[PDB]
């Protein structure tokens, strides 16, 4: 029994396993906004849009 336990003990005497986890976040945002106000104002003939 002592020997069997010793063999298992040998298996157990294992270093805790560390892992380095590198998860990377990549965010890309591309933005285009165009607004056009087209304006014709004349008050002489009262024409204005």
């Amino acid at each position: 029994r002592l020997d069997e336990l010793r063999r298992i003990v040998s298996q157990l005497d294992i270093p805790v396993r560390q892992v380095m986890i590198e998860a990377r976040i990549v965010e890309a945002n591309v933005g285009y906004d165009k607004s056009l106000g087209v304006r014709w104002g004349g008050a002489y003939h009262k024409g204005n849009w």
């Binding site: 104002g41 008050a43 002489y44 009262k46 024409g47 204005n48």
Partner: peptide, 26 residues
Amino acid sequence: SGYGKDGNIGIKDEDPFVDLGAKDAT
């Protein structure tokens, strides 16, 4: 008077180059 872009020139006849310009800005 209109409605969609309401207009009734008599009411502001009570009130041309200045009044209509603004009124008609729309």
